[PDB]
Each structure stands twice: as C-alpha cells, then as structure tokens.
Amino acid sequence: SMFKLTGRKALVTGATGGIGEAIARCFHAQGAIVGLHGTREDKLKEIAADLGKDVFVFSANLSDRKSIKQLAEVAEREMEGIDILVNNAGIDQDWDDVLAVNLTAASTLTRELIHSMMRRRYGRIINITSIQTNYCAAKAGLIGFSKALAQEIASRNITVNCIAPGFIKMIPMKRMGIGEEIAFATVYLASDEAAYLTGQTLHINGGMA
Amino acid sequence: SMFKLTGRKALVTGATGGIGEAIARCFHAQGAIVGLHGTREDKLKEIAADLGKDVFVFSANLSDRKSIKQLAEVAEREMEGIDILVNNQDQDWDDVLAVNLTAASTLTRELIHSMMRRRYGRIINITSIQTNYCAAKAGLIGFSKALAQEIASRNITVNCIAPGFIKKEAIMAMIPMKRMGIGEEIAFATVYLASDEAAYLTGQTLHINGGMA
Amino acid sequence: SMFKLTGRKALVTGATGGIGEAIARCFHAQGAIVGLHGTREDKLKEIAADLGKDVFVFSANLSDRKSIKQLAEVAEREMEGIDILVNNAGVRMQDQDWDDVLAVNLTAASTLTRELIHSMMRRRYGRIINITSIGQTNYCAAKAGLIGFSKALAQEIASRNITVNCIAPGFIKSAIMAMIPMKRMGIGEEIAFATVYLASDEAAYLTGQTLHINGGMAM
Amino acid sequence: SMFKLTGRKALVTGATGGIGEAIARCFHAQGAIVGLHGTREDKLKEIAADLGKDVFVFSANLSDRKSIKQLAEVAEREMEGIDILVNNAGITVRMQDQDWDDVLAVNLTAASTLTRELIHSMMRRRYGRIINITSIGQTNYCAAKAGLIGFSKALAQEIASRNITVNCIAPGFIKSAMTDKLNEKQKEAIMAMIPMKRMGIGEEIAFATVYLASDEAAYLTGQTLHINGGM
Question: E strands within D18-73?
Fold first, then answer.
C-alpha cells in the first residue's frame, strides 16, 4: 500500500532498547526483513522472539573498528544484501569516546555498506542523532557527514538523511516524545515514497528552538 | 493502517491540477474526507466526481481577504470541522506576496481557531518550486515556524514542503539525483506530515528536491 | 585606516531613534556623508545639528509606495549618488494587522532598495543593509521574508560588487533575560558597529548573510 | 579608534601561510600583541621580524594532544594571558580510515583541545574571544567543519555569561598557491559557483577576524560568518 517496506533488508544498530527497538518493531510491521544489532545478545533474542520471522540478530562492539567491519560483512551475507541502514547506536577520554561512538562508528559502518547499494543503485542511509558540547560536536559532524555523502551518491538512487530527536521518554508542545514517533519518521525516510528527499535532517522535538 | 487519514477532514487549496490534485487524490486514497478548492469549477467537479465519495468543492479568490474568510467559514461549516489544511514590477511584487504568502497565512489563521478548540490539527504549506518568489517562500517558512511555536500546546503541527523541480536540460545538471521529481512525491510527504504518526514533528521544512543546494 | 566609510554616501531610514540614530552617528564618525530619513522633522534636525556637517535630512511616509519612490528620487539627487542603503524603518491595531506589518517591515525595504540599486549597479559598487525587527508571528514572517529577499537579491547583483546583508538584533535596550545566555540586553550601538562592518570595503566578499547579534539566543 | 585591538593578546595558529599570516598582520596593525604558531620556525621568525614589535613565536604539532596542551601553557605564560584565540591551523594505497581520523584530529579535535585549555583564564577575567576558521575527498572535511561549527555554537552557550564570544568564519574560495594552479576549465567551473565571479583574498578573512575579535562584537556569539562571494 503506502510506505510499506516489503522485502527490503534493513540493519538497525542499537536495536536493544528505546528508539532502536521501536524502529525495529515498526520496520517489521511494515514488512521489512530486519537485522538487529546490539551488544546485549539476551535482550536482542527477546525482541526477535517477540516479532518472529524475518529477523536476524547480530552482536558487535561499535567502539572497535575491526568489529564494525565484521558486522558489515556478516550482516550483508546472512541477510543477502542490505537496503536500509539505520545508524542508531550511541551512548579528553570523554571527547574521544563520544566522537568515536556517536560519529566515527556511523561513518565507518556506512562506508562499508554503501558500495553494494551503489552497485544496486538503491539504498537508504538514516542516521539517528543523540537526543552538552561533546555530543553537539559529534551530532553536528554526523549531519555534515550525511549532507556531503548525500551529494556524493545522489545519482545512485541512495538517500542519506538524519533524524534529530528532541526529548524522548521547554518544549512548546508541553510533552515529551516517544520512541515510536522517531520510528514512524524512519519508516517514511526509508520508504520508496521518500526517494527524492536527501541530505535532510528531520528534527522531531515538539517545536524546540 | 500506518499513515492512514481515515475520517480526517482535509481542505486542499489549488487542487485543480499539479501538486494540489496529486495531494487531493492521495488524501482520498488514505481515507480522508477531502475539500477541494480551486478557481476552475469544471475541473474541480471532474476531480470530485472521479474520486466519487465524501468530497466537497469550494471556489474562492485567494487574492481577496474577505473571500478567504468566506471560504474558511463555509468549508469549516459544511465539512463539520477541518482537521488538515494544505495551502498549495511592483504589481508583480504585490501579487506574488498576496498569493504565495498572505493567502496561506490568512486561511490558516481563520481555520486554526476551530482546530485549537478540538486540540487537533495539521497545517501543511507547500511553497513555490526570482526575488519576489524567494521573499514569499522564505516568509511562508518563517510564518510556519513561528506559528508552530504558537499552537504546539494544542496538538496542532505546522510544517512546510519545499519542492524542487517537478515534472533545455541544464536543469538536470542542477540536480545531483539527475531526475525531476513527480507531484505524487510531494503528495506522499504531505500524507506523512498530515498523519497521526507525525504528531511530534512541527516547525519543519521538508526539502524534496533531489539534493539541490 | 581600517573600516572607514570616508567619502561614501549613506541613507539611513528610521534614523530619529534607537538603532537608526546610532547607525547614523557611527557612520558619520567613520567618515560617511550621511542622509537621515525619518517622520519627525524636528528630531532629524536635532540629530543633524549634533553631527554638524555632511548631514542631509529627508522626511517621508514609508507607508506609501509613491512616497518611498519620491524619497529615493530626492535623496539620490541631493546627495549626488547613494552608495550605502540602511533599511531600518520599522490605539491603532498594528501588530495583528498582517497587511500593515508586511507593508512596513518587508515591502517598504524592498521598494526603496529597488529604486536605489539601479545607480549602484551602474557604478558597480554599493551596500544594502537591512535591519530586521528586534503579533509575534506576523513579525517573524515579515523578517523571514526580508532575509529571503536579501539573499535572492544578493545573488542577482553580486557580480556588480553590491553586497546585500541583514542584521537581526536580539533584545535591545529601547523572563526575557532567561532566554539570553549572555544575561544582558544589547544596546543600539552594537547594531551600529555591525552595520559599519558590513558597509565597509573590508566586507566586500560577504554577501547574502544575516548577522544575528543577540547574546547567543537560540532560533 | 573603532575595531582596534590595542593591548589585546591574540594567539593565531597556522600563522606561517595564507589566511593565518593575513590574520596575524591585520591583528598587529590594529594594536594586538600577537602570538604566531606554526611548524616552519624560520618562516615564523621572518614574519615576526617584519612586524617588528609585540610578537611571539611558537612551534607545536597540533596532531599531538600533549603538544597542544604544552603550546597553551607556554603561550599563556610568555604572553602573560591570552585574550583572543584564532584556531586557523588545519589541512586542506592510503588507509581511508586513517585519513578520516587525521582530518578529525587536525580540523576538529585540535581546535577544541586548544580552546578548552585557554578558556579557563578567559572565564576568570570575564573576557575573551574564540574564533575558529574552518577549512575552505571532501566528505571527511565537511564532517570536521560541521563538527567544529557545532562545537563552537554549544561552547558559546556555555560561556556567554563570562563575556567570551565563540564564532566561526567559513571561507569560500580564497586565492592561494593551490587555486593559482587551476587550469582554464577548472577555473571556469569554480567561477560559475561564485555569484561575485571572483575569489576572495586572505585579508578579507582577516578583516572579519578583526571584527569578531573587537570589543564592538561583544554581543555577537554562536555565529558563522560565511565569506564566500555569495556561494
């Protein structure tokens, strides 16, 4: 019908709780073949059991580069080609850790999977930013990475977009958001209907300034 | 059932061709009760008939303030409450500002009173695809962002869609994606924004333009 | 010397109070030949008298198009060419009158600008600086419309060495403070100093921009 | 005497060439006491000699964290306090991952490290200026630049109440050895992107840095000045 993801293969990182879980569920309800990533194997299998069929579980430490490359190679083979990547995992030492986990991990995993998408002339990359100064830097860097990548691969029918969530469970709407509202947006961006939308950030935050 | 508009009342301006007609048809497909405004009454009824169920048709001069208030009053009454509004050299300046900015703000202001009373509404402004046009477009976006702040506490969202090139080819050189968009692509974005599933998304502009800078 | 406006002819609208007056005084101090627009003729003369020499005074209603065209006509003649235009001009229900807010805060600046770029284009040199407004929904709309106008016009005439920029002031001394990270209100002179910078030869490569001078306010 | 920097202490990184050198000369012309950082010790001394008075010279590898910390300590002690920091230094089978790490380290992390070392004293004096000059394979650079801008906007919120402003300048195409080398079609392709139909010059960036550093720009913070001829 509309905004269905039937038969598309999606890898979602940080799929263990919160927004990543909600994205996972929502993708599945729209007919996607979903691959869940996290570090808690027990919590993942629990989610895959809740949903049932067309679900894969993967473990990887996204703070380790070799481990990110391993995740890509394995998810791509076992899922047989990835269509949609949702980068959703996040959180001097502090600065380095946040940049590593909130920016570099997404760009590493993205660059591993874009080649196959470029061959197929079809893909969706969706970066979910974190909800202080280190986080703001990594977040703004991820958005800049996303916009520049969008320009690079636009002619290959791959879109690259970000979602910037507000306060999720000084908001003009006078309520916090829920993870499923982020999920719905991710379905929209992932769908064929959003083929002409790229290089964008959806701020989902109740009107925050 | 995701992104359905079942039973929602939607008023679409400029529904007679192009993006407006595509939005009207998509809304109808998603279960919306649709009000079609335009200036070509024969075209409006042809479209209405083609849809064939729960359709209203309205004529009005959007360059005339009093005419806009009348459209609002009549549409709100006949449709029994509107949930979704889609707003779709000196003489040249005034006319472009009148039709591309002032009309949308005037109709929006008239219809939000009843949306606020129901604590539910969607306002979606479609901007134009030159310095008069840019002023009107930027004004509309600024209008949308400021209004979103004003009425967010009533569960009314206000968003904009800025279309790129819609269907020689030095145009194709301007578009990184290397194709023009089609009107249905604007329509799909309007459906998303109109849905219950976009309730926390307000004050935003969706730039649907294949990556144009 | 750096950031001087020596010899340049500048027309400043809404020059009788606040930011306008500060712009005019700062322009004069930096060597500009200054033309003051306003409505209150007496206030114009008081300011002109303080600056002394190199000052022109013009009165005109910016609410009538013909009156704006006449101002452009007269000022361009008496000053013998205008290089710098500062668009600053901003119970009757005023704020909830969309038509009026748009007329005075957007259309007026666009009408005057378009009367005066003609000669700037011929000379291949000029500066347009639009000072935006400091009910609220109407003002935001006119402000965003002005910034859009300025950005588009900047593209059109960049090749003629005319820059077009806006300054968007935050809270300026004529709950509030909780919104300003710097925990103070700005003063008019601070907008004046930004206007000097943009008007200068040193800002020749900066066009189509908005300087938000607001103590770090969000949005 | 408008936009003067008389008696203010300014540290300028990447000051041996291009924009950095133009900033340093402009600052010195406005009465600033200037600290020149770079890697070419001799090129630094030439510039210092030409300026002739109220100049200090420093070397440091901005890709090494301990070396950035050392620069901050030694510059602040020698200059007896730093009021203005201009983060200018940067860069314009290879291991693509290493190239990512290097661009982030040099164009984002270096600036944030030096800034964090120097704002404490500024916060104590309740006065200061942080000015980040962003860079002019582009995807890695765009990420670092966007990151630096986001770092600057956040920091600006954090320290606005201490009257330290934090701003960025994003230059467009500025004339240099590199642009001078462009062939006819490359040149014509670049001009078509620039409404003003000319490249900027380094002094144009310098003038903007003077503006932001001045007392006249005390209410301007969290901003990026795009100096790019309409691009």
Answer: 33-38, 55-59
Cβ contacts (< 8 Å) between D220 and chain C: which residues?
Answer: 190, 194, 211-213
DSSP sequence for chain A: --S--TT-EEEESSTTSHHHHHHHHHHHHTT-EEEEEES-HHHHHHHHHHH-SSEEEEE--TTSHHHHHHHHHHHHHHHTS--EEEE-----HHHHHHHIIIIIHHHHHHHHHHHHHHHHT-EEEEEEPP--HHHHHHHHHHHHHHHHHHHHHGGGTEEEEEEEE-SB---TT-S-B-HHHHHHHHHHHHSGGGTT--S-EEEESTT--
* Closest residue to B142, CB basis, from C98, C144, C153: C144
Q: Which residues are CB-neighbours of B41 under 8 A, at least 6 positions away? A: B57, B59
Q: Based on DSSP, count helices (H) and strands (E) in chain B, helices before strands.
A: 8, 7
Q: Do A137 and D65 touch (CB under 8 A)?
A: no
Cβ–Cβ under 8 Å, residues D136 and D102: no
As beta bridge partners, residue A87 has A127
What order do you get walking across the sheet with D164-171 strand by strand?
A: D55-59, D33-38, D9-12, D84-87, D128-133, D164-171, D224-227
Q: Is C77 helix (H, G, I), strand (E, B) or coil?
A: helix
User: Which chain D residues touch A149 with a CB distance below 8 Å?
Assistant: 139
Q: Does B202 touch chain A (CB under 8 A)?
A: yes
Residues of A serving a catalytic function are 135
Tokens in use for C134? Answer: 């400091």
What are the tokens at B78?
A: 């006949």
Subunits next to A (3 or more Cβ pairs <8 Å) are B, D
According to DSSP, residue C206 is labeled -
For chain B, which domains are there?
Answer: 1-213 (3.40.50.720)
Task: Check C151 against B138: CB less than 8 A apart.
Answer: yes
Instruction: Note whether C217 and C179 are within 8 A (CB).
Output: yes
Of A185, A193, A202, the CB nearest to B188: A193
β-bridge mates for residue C126, sequence order: C162
DSSP assignment letter at B128 = P
Q: Are strands B156-163 and B121-126 parallel, antiparallel or unpaired?
A: parallel
Altogether, the residues listed in chain A come to a count of: 209
Choose the closest CB to A172 out of B149, B197, B211: B149
CB burial of D211-221 (b: ≥16 within 10 Å; e: otherwise) equals bbbbebbbbbb
Q: Is D104 in Cβ contact with A111 (below 8 Å)?
A: no
How distant is the Cα of B56 from the closest Cα of chain A, in angstroms? 24
Q: Which chains touch B (3 or more CB pairs under 8 A)?
A: A, C
Q: From the CA of C123, how many Å to the nearest CA of chain D?
A: 15
Asked whether A44 and A15 are in contact (CB, 8 A), the reply is: yes
Q: What's the token pair of residue A97?
A: 């850790």
Give the whole-angstrom CA distance, residue B111 versus residue B87: 12
Closest Cα to residue B161, out of B114, B198, B130, B120?
B198
B130 and chain C: CB distance < 8 Å anywhere?
yes
Resolved by: X-ray
Cα distances from A132 to residues A138, A147, A204, D122, D156, in angstroms, run 11, 23, 18, 20, 11
User: Given CB atoms, is C214 within the 8 Å cutoff of chain D?
Assistant: yes
C-alpha to C-alpha distance for C88 and C104, rounded to whole angstroms: 10
